[PDB]
Amino acid sequence: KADQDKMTQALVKLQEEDPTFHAHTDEETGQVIIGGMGELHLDILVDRMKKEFNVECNVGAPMVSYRETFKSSAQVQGKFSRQSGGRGQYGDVHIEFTPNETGAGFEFENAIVGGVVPREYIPSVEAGLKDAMENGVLA
Amino acid sequence: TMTDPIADMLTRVRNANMVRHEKLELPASNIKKEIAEILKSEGFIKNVEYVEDDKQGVLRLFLKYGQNDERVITGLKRISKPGLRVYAKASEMPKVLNGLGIALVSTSEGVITDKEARKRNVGGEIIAYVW
Amino acid sequence: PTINQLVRKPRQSKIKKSDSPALNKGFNSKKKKFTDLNSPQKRGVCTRVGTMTPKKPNSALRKYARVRLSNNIEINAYIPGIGHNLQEHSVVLVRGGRVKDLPGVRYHIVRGALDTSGVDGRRQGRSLYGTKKPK
RNA sequence: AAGGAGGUAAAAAUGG
RNA sequence: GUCGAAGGUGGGACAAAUGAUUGGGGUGAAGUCGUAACAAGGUAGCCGUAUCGGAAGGUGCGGCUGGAUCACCUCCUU
RNA sequence: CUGCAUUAGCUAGUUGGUAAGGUAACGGCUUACCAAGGCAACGAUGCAUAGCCGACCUGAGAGGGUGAUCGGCCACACUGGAACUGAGACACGGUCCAGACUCCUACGGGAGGCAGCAGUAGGGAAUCUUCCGCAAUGGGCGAAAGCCUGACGGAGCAACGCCGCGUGAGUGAUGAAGGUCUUCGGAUCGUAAAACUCUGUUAUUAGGGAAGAACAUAUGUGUAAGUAACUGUGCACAUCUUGACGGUACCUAAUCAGAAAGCCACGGCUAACUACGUGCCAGCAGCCGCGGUAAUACGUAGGUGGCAAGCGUUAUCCGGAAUUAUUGGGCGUAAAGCGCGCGUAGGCGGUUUUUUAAGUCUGAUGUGAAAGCCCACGGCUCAACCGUGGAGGGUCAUUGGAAACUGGAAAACUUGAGUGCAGAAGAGGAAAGUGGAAUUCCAUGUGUAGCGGUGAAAUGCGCAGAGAUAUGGAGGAACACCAGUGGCGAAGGCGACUUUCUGGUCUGUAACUGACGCUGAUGUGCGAAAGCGUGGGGAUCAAACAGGAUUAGAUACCCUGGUAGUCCACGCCGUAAACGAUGAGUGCUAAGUGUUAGGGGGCCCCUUAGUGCUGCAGCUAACGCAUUAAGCACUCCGCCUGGGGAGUACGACCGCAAGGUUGAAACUCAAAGGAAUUGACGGGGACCCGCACAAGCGGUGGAGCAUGUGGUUUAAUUCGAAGCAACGCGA
RNA sequence: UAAGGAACUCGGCAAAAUGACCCCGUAACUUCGGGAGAAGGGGUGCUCUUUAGGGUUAACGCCCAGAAGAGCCGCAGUGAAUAGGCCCAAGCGACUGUUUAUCAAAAACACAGGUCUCUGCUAAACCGUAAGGUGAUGUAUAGGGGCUGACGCCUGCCCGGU
Numbered sequence A: 001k002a003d004q005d006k007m008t009q010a011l012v013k014l015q016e017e018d019p020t021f022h023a024h025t026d027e028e029t030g031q032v033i034i035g036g037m038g039e040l041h042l043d044i045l046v047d048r049m050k051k052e053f054n055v056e057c058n059v060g061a062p063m064v065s066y067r068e069t070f071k072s073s074a075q076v077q078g079k080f081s082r083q084s085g086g087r088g089q090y091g092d093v094h095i096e097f098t099p100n101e102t103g104a105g106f107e108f109e110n111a112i113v114g115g116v117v118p119r120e121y122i123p124s125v126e127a128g129l130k131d132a133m134e135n136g137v138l139a
Numbered sequence B: 001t002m003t004d005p006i007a008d009m010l011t012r013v014r015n016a017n018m019v020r021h022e023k024l025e026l027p028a029s030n031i032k033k034e035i036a037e038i039l040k041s042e043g044f045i046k047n048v049e050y051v052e053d054d055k056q057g058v059l060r061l062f063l064k065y066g067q068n069d070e071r072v073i074t075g076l077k078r079i080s081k082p083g084l085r086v087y088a089k090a091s092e093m094p095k096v097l098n099g100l101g102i103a104l105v106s107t108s109e110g111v112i113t114d115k116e117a118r119k120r121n122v123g124g125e126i127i128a129y130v131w
Numbered sequence C: 001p002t003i004n005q006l007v008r009k010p011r012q013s014k015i016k017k018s019d020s021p022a023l024n025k026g027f028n029s030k031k032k033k034f035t036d037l038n039s040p041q042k043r044g045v046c047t048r049v050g051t052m053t054p055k056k057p058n059s060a061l062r063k064y065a066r067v068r069l070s071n072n073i074e075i076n077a078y079i080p081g082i083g084h085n086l087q088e089h090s091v092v093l094v095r096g097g098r099v100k101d102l103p104g105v106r107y108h109i110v111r112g113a114l115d116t117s118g119v120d121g122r123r124q125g126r127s128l129y130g131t132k133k134p135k
Numbered sequence D: 001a002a003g004g005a006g007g008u009a010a011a012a013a014u015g016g
Numbered sequence E: 001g002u003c004g005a006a007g008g009u010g011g012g013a014c015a016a017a018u019g020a021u022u023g024g025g026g027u028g029a030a031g032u033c034g035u036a037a038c039a040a041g042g043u044a045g046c047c048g049u050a051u052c053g054g055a056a057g058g059u060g061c062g063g064c065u066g067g068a069u070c071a072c073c074u075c076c077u078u
Numbered sequence F: 001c002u003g004c005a006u007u008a009g010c011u012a013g014u015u016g017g018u019a020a021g022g023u024a025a026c027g028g029c030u031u032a033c034c035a036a037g038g039c040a041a042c043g044a045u046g047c048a049u050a051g052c053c054g055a056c057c058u059g060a061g062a063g064g065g066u067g068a069u070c071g072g073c074c075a076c077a078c079u080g081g082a083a084c085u086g087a088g089a090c091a092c093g094g095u096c097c098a099g100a101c102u103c104c105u106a107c108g109g110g111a112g113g114c115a116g117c118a119g120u121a122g123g124g125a126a127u128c129u130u131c132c133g134c135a136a137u138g139g140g141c142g143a144a145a146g147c148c149u150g151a152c153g154g155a156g157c158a159a160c161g162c163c164g165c166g167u168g169a170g171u172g173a174u175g176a177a178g179g180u181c182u183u184c185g186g187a188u189c190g191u192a193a194a195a196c197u198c199u200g201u202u203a204u205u206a207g208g209g210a211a212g213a214a215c216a217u218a219u220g221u222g223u224a225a226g227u228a229a230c231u232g233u234g235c236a237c238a239u240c241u242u243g244a245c246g247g248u249a250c251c252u253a254a255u256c257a258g259a260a261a262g263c264c265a266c267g268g269c270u271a272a273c274u275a276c277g278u279g280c281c282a283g284c285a286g287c288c289g290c291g292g293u294a295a296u297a298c299g300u301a302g303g304u305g306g307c308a309a310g311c312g313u314u315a316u317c318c319g320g321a322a323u324u325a326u327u328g329g330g331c332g333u334a335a336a337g338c339g340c341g342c343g344u345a346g347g348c349g350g351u352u353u354u355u356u357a358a359g360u361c362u363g364a365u366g367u368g369a370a371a372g373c374c375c376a377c378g379g380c381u382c383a384a385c386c387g388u389g390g391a392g393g394g395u396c397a398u399u400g401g402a403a404a405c406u407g408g409a410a411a412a413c414u415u416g417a418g419u420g421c422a423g424a425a426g427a428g429g430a431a432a433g434u435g436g437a438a439u440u441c442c443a444u445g446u447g448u449a450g451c452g453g454u455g456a457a458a459u460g461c462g463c464a465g466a467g468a469u470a471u472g473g474a475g476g477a478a479c480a481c482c483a484g485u486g487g488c489g490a491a492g493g494c495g496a497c498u499u500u501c502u503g504g505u506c507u508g509u510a511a512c513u514g515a516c517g518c519u520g521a522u523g524u525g526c527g528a529a530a531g532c533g534u535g536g537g538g539a540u541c542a543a544a545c546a547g548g549a550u551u552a553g554a555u556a557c558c559c560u561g562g563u564a565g566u567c568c569a570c571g572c573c574g575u576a577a578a579c580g581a582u583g584a585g586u587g588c589u590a591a592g593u594g595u596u597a598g599g600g601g602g603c604c605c606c607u608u609a610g611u612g613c614u615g616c617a618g619c620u621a622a623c624g625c626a627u628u629a630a631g632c633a634c635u636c637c638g639c640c641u642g643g644g645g646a647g648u649a650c651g652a653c654c655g656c657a658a659g660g661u662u663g664a665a666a667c668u669c670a671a672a673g674g675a676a677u678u679g680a681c682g683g684g685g686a687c688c689c690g691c692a693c694a695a696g697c698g699g700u701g702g703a704g705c706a707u708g709u710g711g712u713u714u715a716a717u718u719c720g721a722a723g724c725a726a727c728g729c730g731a
Numbered sequence G: 001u002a003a004g005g006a007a008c009u010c011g012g013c014a015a016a017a018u019g020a021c022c023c024c025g026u027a028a029c030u031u032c033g034g035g036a037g038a039a040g041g042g043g044u045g046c047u048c049u050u051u052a053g054g055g056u057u058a059a060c061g062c063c064c065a066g067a068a069g070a071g072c073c074g075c076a077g078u079g080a081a082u083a084g085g086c087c088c089a090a091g092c093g094a095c096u097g098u099u100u101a102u103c104a105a106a107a108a109c110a111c112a113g114g115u116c117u118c119u120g121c122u123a124a125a126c127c128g129u130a131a132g133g134u135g136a137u138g139u140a141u142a143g144g145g146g147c148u149g150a151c152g153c154c155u156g157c158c159c160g161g162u
Ligand SMILES: [Mg+2]
Pocket: E041
């Protein structure tokens, strides 16, 4: 890892030398990927980085960013109470989770009647759902 | 113990002037007597008397107050001190209060005022400022 | 103090510290050492890019980058303006000037220098954000 | 008559 | 042959980097436990020292007033 | 001419002498001998950093910062050593050796040193052309023409800086269109624009076109030294020729307002305000801060402000900062007086006389290069710039003068400081001895069921006879009244009495010494309590500890016990709010009134030294201090420089240990603090009042019933009211 | 005993190596004694010249004993023999000592030091039926027994059971 700066500089010089060789960072995986015209191309470029630029590097198959989803629908409830100590905090929600049509994305609907949930906290509920779904629930 | 008789004399004069005393008795010395004579000549004090007694004698100053009881002496400041002595050239002689005051000096030609030092083109140890 | 005391131990002035220490140091690779040199900016590589929460009473998601400088010192630099195109391994120019809200952020990333792009849609004070004249 | 200094008792539930 | 750079061997000195692990320190958002201090802060507080206790802290010994206070005598000032 | 003591010892050819060798030269420069010298708290040695200066930036100055360009001096030339040649080198583009590194090779062997000028790679935020010419100045060689000269003279690139000029000027209300705001009238961009007229700095085109150039050499004469006389040589006057820049600067003629304005800011500091979007988000920010629906602080638009071929940001230095204070600050409570003595070096020092001239003052001479800064003048059209004079700049050196002060020498004085003589008080210290009260324990007689304790309790002690009471004994510790803003001591501290040894202080006298003094780094001692070691002692009290109680809990406060310790001897530790939070010495500056120990003059007056209170002038942010200053002055010492981090870490020294002394930084905040003011509050106080107590009459609480309320139940038992100030209340 | 040099082996077992005298020099740590012969290095024969000395003697003489220089020889001079290998760490026991005669020498025992406990003297404890003895011709700073085991810093809670 002490040679990552040398690796970046070598990649820059090599991209200026060869138009067909590309290097980019993937945000999701936080990995740097090198694209070439073939196995021979990438092998020669790896060896040239190792020797000419004195940056020994290892290469592998790029990691694939997976996603999760719900296959079954269900009504569910969550209730958090923290009144035992000091300040007391109460929250309670009842949400139906449904498998959305593939590719439609997350969809939040607010079927609140009677103001049981103050309208002030509904955006907070949506933000909590978004954070929690950003964090995986299975893997 | 005592370390600056000139300082002490000036401080006696200052304290008496503050309290608006009329006379002032201090132990005498040649330098104190010359300073007192310079003050009398310049007009800051009324009179000077010397008592030639034993134990070095005494100097009896009589202070001068103007009309409305105003004080003729605004302030006296010791310049050269035992801890750090100050000397000046003829061309570097200081003017007290833009000339409205005197700087008492000690010179090869006797202790005189800064005006006389500048006139005779001499320097020396700046004993005190008075204004 | 007495004059004699000053003469024995002279007066000593308070020493002044730099607000941007990371810019005052260069690095010699051959001798593998640091060297004292005052610089107005330094190149660096963004080790991390992200957001930080300011201290009270302010509230926000302030954009910043953890940068390794050319002298091997790792610092937090604020990213000014609306929107930025920085990620890890981006090469950025860093100048002095801390962000009062952010505790450990003592430098700024220059906009419109090296990889960093100018602020898109900026029309007043454009030089401060590296935006060309639209015309 | 009103203020400054020293000694010296007797009393006491708990939470705001 | 003398002197003699570099080199070799040896035990020490000094400086810097780095090190499993470890120590307290600072900062931080509505965190948890109690409530030490500020009123006599509900056991006056603080200083030095010792020991004890989750924690603030408690307790003992000496010291300070930078301590409030009802009744008493003892003087001193106008 | 530099930082560190968290570097105190260094030095053995080292210091000196003798002899010799060696060198341009003196010399431990080197060697032989003899000696033990030399340096150092006036900072040696060690470590770190650094070329020095003229100067440059800043500042009113004093100062602070810096050491690019240009000039001087030094040092170095891949690293180290060496010598050769030479007048000169221990030699950048020389030699030899060694080392590291690199290159060529036919593998036998060879070669190299850009910190010369360009340029390449690398590092970096960042710094240029592998340019033209020796025409000018200078240098080397040559008799000279001349050759060489990446010195130098030029050109190229870079807004990098400074200076200069542009991007147009006059008229122009008819306030044109259009943007923005609007109170829907209008305001503003705005004489701005349009249009008419004018100029060409600039720009384009075409012509003319410098100076810098002196020369040298060569050719003619004239003159001067020498010659027997020429050629030659010196000098003088003439003539041909010599330009990289460059057909550049500059000048002339014609054409066109036509090609030539951007940056930041507009909440306060700080010149400049409005509308929209956003809505503690996005964002801004040097500080204070701004942003959650009315944002002059975020983004855009109009307008405005400051600058302008520049404008902003970052970095660094000085300033503002008197925020290290010599100029020019402080230490009672804001940071700061060592806990206190004794005392070394150093700093400072009473009065008079004579003398010296180190400091001090004054005149002359030399020098402080040039360039620079400042003043003046001159030349580029101006300016920057260039040139020329002046002035300035030393803590400089030599020399001649003055003697008041500081310094040196000599001689006197008694006022300060000590001593003698006559007196005074004292819980000053050390060691032995004696004594009364009280507590605890032990033994015994009488005696019964409690004692003790607290807010209330319980633990505990007691039916074995407790507690109480009486007598006797054992032992330890402290000394009731006197006792007092009283006394003594440097401080800590010292309180029964007696004896022995011993310290200090105060009063009067004026013989006696004659300045012998003050302060005091480093050092050396004492130093409350706790604590430690050894050996004793052990009543009381009492950390730890056990039990009881209180409490939501109670590792406490309270209660019952209880060990170390509290006491003694000898050692150790060396710290306290060790405080007057106030260093020591000295003198001066209104007063009133106590008290302690004296003295003098008539209950009174005066006076010395303490100890208190009140209070002028003066001081202070205020509180307050105020002859026992925190006033006015002088000397010396110690200490401070925002709050945390931290009295911490590291190093050092001390300690048995506990720890003590010395003592940072990174990082973090914009505060932390003092005195005083107004409120509010207090499990602070004083006083005053009220059917608040008290005096008294009658009630409620007890019974039945009416009604309201809580609870429960129900389909609902509608909702509201909850201490006083909800409950025959909204009703 | 070539080259190698722990690759051997459970293990460097054995062997090898060091070894004398003089000189230089010598660390952490420490209870300040030490560690230490630390470590790590240099010298060592013979001849001659010059020369400071000490003991014994009138002296000569005899004996002891250095210093400097110049030479000579060998592969090699404490020329043979005899004469420490050293260092860095960890566990255990403080240390010198003692022990299974004849398979165990150690970390076991002992130890100086600590503490508990008994014992007022015809002591307690021990031997013996007793007499008589040890203890001790001692007397609580003494004597017996238990446990611990230099030194340094310490040694907490429980008395329900025995
Ligand atoms: Mg409390």
